[PDB]
Structures are given as structure tokens and as C-alpha cells.
Amino acid sequence: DTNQREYYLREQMKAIQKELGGEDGLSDLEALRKKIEEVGMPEAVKTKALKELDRLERMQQGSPEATVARTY
Amino acid sequence: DTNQREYYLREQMKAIQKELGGEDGLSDLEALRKKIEEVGMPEAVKTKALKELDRLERMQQGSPEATVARTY
Amino acid sequence: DTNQREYYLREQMKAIQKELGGEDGLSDLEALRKKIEEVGMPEAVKTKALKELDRLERMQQGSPEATVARTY
Amino acid sequence: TSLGRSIARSMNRKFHRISLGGVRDEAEIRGHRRTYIGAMPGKLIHAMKQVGVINPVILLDEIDKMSSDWRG
Question: Which residues make up the binding site for ADP 11 (chain D) (predicted)?
Fold first, then answer.
């Protein structure tokens, strides 16, 4: 019961860390989405970048996926 | 009204954070969050401090991630 | 079903855990509360003694933070 | 050890012995993180607990074998 309650509460914590507006959990995430698009890359680079873009929508205390995805 | 909204969310976190993570560390965490604004800090520094604050408000676990974020 | 069984086995680990290792002293509480007053603590030392006393009388044995607070 | 005991007798203090050989971290010098049950104070706090005076004569044993192995 306590673990279910803790997961519930931490998940509202995740659902209220969306900066209130809910556009993105972290600004860095939405910045990379447009920065990939706003740069003219070849079909070999742009198309792949559009798929490693899906590694985003993660935050530091959650999955460490974005930790190196943002750097890449 | 929106500011009181954000601080009501902070009321939720502070009411549930009791005896979770570090109860003593709660005062340190709040002091560091306040010093984020008190100390004149660069905007990128402010953004990464907010990243670590999101890596706090910890109703996930009392994991070393929370402790290392407090030390950070 | 096998993941549920493994998760329940981890829960069995963490529920059989407290016994040899974890220890609680409910009888000492009153002694610890009284001996604060009759043995003079320095100003900061008295402040942290009052702090650790405040950490009890709300949570005393049912949380990891309360028992380490009692040990302190 | 008898030398330190007699020195404490000369000043009419209470003497103590704490061994530091076999320690390469600060977990037994300082305490442990205040985020869990199991946090343990350092050898110095043991020395104060086992002595009955504000002003003991703390004996640090085997200090020459201190080196950086882990935890700094």
C-alpha cells in the first residue's frame, strides 16, 4: 500500500514539474526538438536525429536517457 | 494567484516530505532553493539549479540521487 | 506472474530484514527526553537536541528517518 | 596508552583510546549521511560516549598508516 501511494505521489510530482504549462517537463528537451529542425541537415543526419529525438522527454532524477541524449 | 498556486504545490511537497529523504535535509534543501534566487546567479546556473530542484522535491526515494543533489 | 513473484520475494527480503540488524528502544524515549534538560547542552548543541526531540513524538519507530533521529 | 592514562591522571582528566588503524575513509572519522537508518557516528563520537567529561584526552592510534584508498 505504501509503495503504491509513493508511486502515486511521486507521479503527481512528475505531473506538476511540467513547469505548470505542461509544454515540456524540461526546457532543454523542447529546445533540442526545434534546434534539430531549425538546422538544415542532410537526409542521412536529419532523419536519424528525428529518431534519436525520441530519447528525450526524460528528466534527471528519472531515466538517465536524456543525460547523454542532450549532450549528443 | 499563479504564484500562490506554485507555492500551494510547494505546500503539498513540504506537507508530504515529512520524514522522507532527509527530514533534517529538508531545511538545507529549502535554504538552497531560496539561495538560488537570493544569490545573484547566471541564468544557465539558475536553470541547472532548477534541474537539480526537479531532481529534488523527492517523493520518489531517499536514494543517494537525492543526497547527491543536496550536495550539488 | 513471475515478475510479481520476484517483486514479492524482494518484499519478503525487505520485510524479513528488520530483526537482526534493525533495533528499536521505545522504553528509552522518556529517558532521552528527560536527560536533555538535566544535562546542560551548549547553545547549538541544545538547539540540535531540541531538533532531534522534535523529530520524535510524531514519528518514532515506523520510519527510517525517525529511528536514526532517535539514535542521534 | 599507559603514558596517556598517567598524563590524564596528572591533569585529573579522564583518558580514552580509539584505534584508527584499518580505516581509510571518513565514515569512521565523520558520521554517515542523514537520509536512512544505519547512519553511524565516527570513532571520535564513540570516544566522547565512552568518556564521562567534556574535556577528555583523546588518543588517536595508528595515525601513520592513513592513506587515500576510497571516499577520499
Answer: 1-2, 17
On whether the CB atoms of residues D69 and D28 are closer than 8 A, the answer is no
* Beta-bridge partners for D35: none
Distance CA A11, CA B59 (A): 9
Q: Which three cell numbers stand for residue D22?
A: 584499518
**Chain D: nearest CA to B68, how far in angstroms?**
10
Inter-chain CB proximity B19 and C63 less than 8 Å: yes
What is the distance in angstroms between the Cα of D33 and the nearest Cα belonging to chain B?
A: 8
The experimental technique behind this entry is cryo-EM
**Cβ-Cβ contacts under 8 Å for D2 (sequence gap 6 or more):** none
d(CA B25, CA B40): 23
Residue A32 makes CB contacts below 8 A (sequence gap 6+) with A53, A56, A70
What is the number of other CB atoms lying within 10 angstroms of the CB of residue A54?
9
Our measurement of the distance from residue A23's CA atom to the centroid of its chain's CA atoms, rounded to an integer in Å, reads 11
Please check whether residue C71 touches D, CB under 8 A: yes
* Closest alpha carbon within chain D to B64: D35
Nearest alpha-carbon partner for B33 in B60, B64, B6: B6
